Amino acid sequence: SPNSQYLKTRILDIYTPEQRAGIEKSEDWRQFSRRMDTHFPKLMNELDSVYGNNEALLPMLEMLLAQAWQSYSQRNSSLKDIDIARENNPDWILSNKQVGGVCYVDLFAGDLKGLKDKIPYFQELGLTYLYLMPLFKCPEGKSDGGYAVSSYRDVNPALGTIGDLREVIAALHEAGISAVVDFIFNHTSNEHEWAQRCAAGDPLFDNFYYIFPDRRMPDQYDRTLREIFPDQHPGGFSQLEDGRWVWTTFNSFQWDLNYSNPWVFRAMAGEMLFLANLGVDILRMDAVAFIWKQMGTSCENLPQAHALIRAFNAVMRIAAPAVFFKSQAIVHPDQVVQYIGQDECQIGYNPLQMALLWNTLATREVNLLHQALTYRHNLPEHTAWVNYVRSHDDIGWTFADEDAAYLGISGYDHRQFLNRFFVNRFDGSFARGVPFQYNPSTGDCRVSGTAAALVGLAQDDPHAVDRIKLLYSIALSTGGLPLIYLGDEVGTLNDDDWSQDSNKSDDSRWAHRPRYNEALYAQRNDPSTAAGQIYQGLRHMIAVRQSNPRFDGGRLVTFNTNNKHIIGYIRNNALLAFGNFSEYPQTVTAHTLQAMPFKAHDLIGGKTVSLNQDLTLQPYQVMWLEIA
Ligand SMILES: OC[C@H]1O[C@H](O[C@H]2[C@H](O)[C@@H](O)[C@@H](O[C@H]3[C@H](O)[C@@H](O)[C@@H](O[C@H]4[C@H](O)[C@@H](O)[C@@H](O)O[C@@H]4CO)O[C@@H]3CO)O[C@@H]2CO)[C@H](O)[C@@H](O)[C@@H]1O
Ligand SMILES: OC[C@H]1O[C@H](O[C@H]2[C@H](O)[C@@H](O)[C@@H](O)O[C@@H]2CO)[C@H](O)[C@@H](O)[C@@H]1O
User: Does 98-186+259-554 carry CATH code 1.10.287.1080?
Assistant: First the structure.
C-alpha cells in the first residue's frame, strides 16, 4: 500500500513547476498535507480491509485524493475556520448547550426561502441544530418522502435551488445553528442517471448496483434477508421490466448501491465532499447497516459496512474536518452502538431509549427503561447519542429480547401488546396511532402517529400534555444531543388526508408528517391551551438544559427509586432526575432518599423539595433536583 507522502507528490503533478512551488507554500496545502499524514493511514487501512488487492483500489484512491484536495482548496474560508474549531473540540456534540430540531422544508415552511424566514422561531425555541429532510431531486409522486434520490446535486425544484440551500445554510450559521441533512448513500432512485446507465449496460457504470439475471441468487439471499417494507415486496429484490432482478432493500424504486465496487465508494465520497462544501455540519448516514452484502448473512451490520463508514470518516478528517456523521441504525441494541465511534459515526440515533420511552408509557413500568439507561447509555469518549421522542419514521420496538428475557419478559409477546396498545386495540389505551408494515409471516409491526396522537391529545386526554413533557424531559436530560420533531412542541396531531392521497395511502408514516399548524403555533404563548402548555413546558426544559452545566456531557448513573413506576438517574453527580410514568401519584420513600440532601431545588417546578421525607410525584410529574 502507498503512503501519504507519495500520494501527495502525485496530487501536485497537475501543477506546472511554477504553480507547484506556490501551492506547497500555501496555508490550504499545509493544512491538507498535515491532515493527510494524520488520517490517511486510517483511510488506507479501512479501504484495504474491504477491497484488498483489487486492481482498482490504487487508481480509485489517487482519483479520490486528487478530488479531496480540489474540494478542500475550494472550501470556503468560514467553513475552514469551523474545521479548525471542531478539529480541536471533538466534544462539541456532547455540550448541554446543543438542542436540535428536525422538519420537512415543504411541510414546515413551504420552501427554502420560507424556511429561511422561520429561523427567528428556531432561535426563539433555542435550537442550535437543525436537520432538514431530503432536499434533492427525486421521482415525482412516490419517492419515499425524498429518500429515493435522482440527483445529489439538483435541489427539488419545489423547494428552491442549490443557491437557496447555500443561503439557508449560511443564514443558519449566522444564527448559531448547525445545518444537518441526509447522506442517502445506500441507494439511489431507479431514475438516477447512474441507475439508468448501469441497467442500460453502460460500461462506465458496470456493477454500480446489484443486478441479477433471474431469481437464483435473489432466492438464496432472501433466505436470510429482513423485510423492511413487506407491503411493497417480499425479500430484498425487485424485478425490472426486462425480467432481471435488482437489490432493493427498501422501495422498488430505490436501488442499493454496490459498494463492493471501489468506484461506487469514490463516487459517493465525491457527493459527500459536495455536501461538505455546502457548509453542512452533520450528515445523517441513511441506512448505514445495509451498505455491504454477503450471501448467507442478514446483509446488515457486516464488518465491511463499518469499515466503509470509517473510510468515509477519514475522508472528512482530511478534506472537511467540520463534517460529523450521525448514524441512524435502527437495529438490535448491540449493533446500534457499534456504529458510534470517533472514527466512524461520532453521534447516532438512540432508538433504544426512544422505543422504551413509549413502552414505559404503555406499561407504566420503568424496568426496561432503567435497564437500558443503566447498561446501554454511556458511550466511548468523543461520541454522543442523539436522543429523540419521535421522527419522520414509524416506531419500531427495537429493545433486545435477551435484555427483556432477563426481566422475565417475552419479546415477541411484549411487542404484540405494544403494537395493540399504540394503535388503540387494547382496552383503555390512550394512544391513537396507526399500524405500519404489519408482516404476516413474522408477526412484526411498527407504529405511525405523532407524539401528541400517541399520548392521547387527539381526544383531549387530560394527561396528554404531561406525558409529552415527560418524554421530552428524558431525551433532554439523559446526556446526548436531543432532537425535537418540530411540531411536537405545540402538540401537532396526525395528518388526516394521507390515507386518501394516492401517493401516500400505502405508507402510514405520512400520518405523522403533518404540515405546519398555524393555529397551534399561534397559541404557543397562551398558558390556557395545550399548545401553550406544551411549548412553555418544553421551552423551559430547553432553557434549563442549555444554561445549567450539570446537564453537560452524555454520561449518567441510574438511581434505584424502589418504585417500579418512577425512573431515576443522576447527571454529573449534581442533578437527580425523577420521572413518574404512572397516571397515578407515586412515591419515592424517605428511606430511599437517605443519601440525598435534606432539601434540593427542583428546576422543573422551581420549588424547594424536601428529601428527608417521602417524595410523592403527581401523575407523569418530572423533577430535576439539584443535589450538588
Ligand atoms: O394503569 C393501566 C393498567 O396498568 C396495569 O396493567 C399494565 C401492567 O401492569 C403492565 O405489566 C403491562 O402489561 C402488559 C405486559 O407488559 C405485556 O408484556 C403483555 O403481557 C403478556 C405477556 O407478554 C405474555 O408473555 C403472557 O404472559 O401474557 C401477558 C398478558 O397478556 O400484556 C400486558 C397487558 O395485558 O401493561 C398493562 C397495561 O398498561 C394494571 O394491572 C391495569 O389494571 C391498569 O389498567
Ligand atoms: O444515592 C445513593 C443511592 O441511594 C439509594 O440507595 C438506597 C437503597 O435503595 C436502600 O436500599 C438503602 O440501602 O438506602 C440507600 C440510600 O442510602 C438509591 O436506590 C441508589 O440507586 C443510589 O445509588
Answer: no
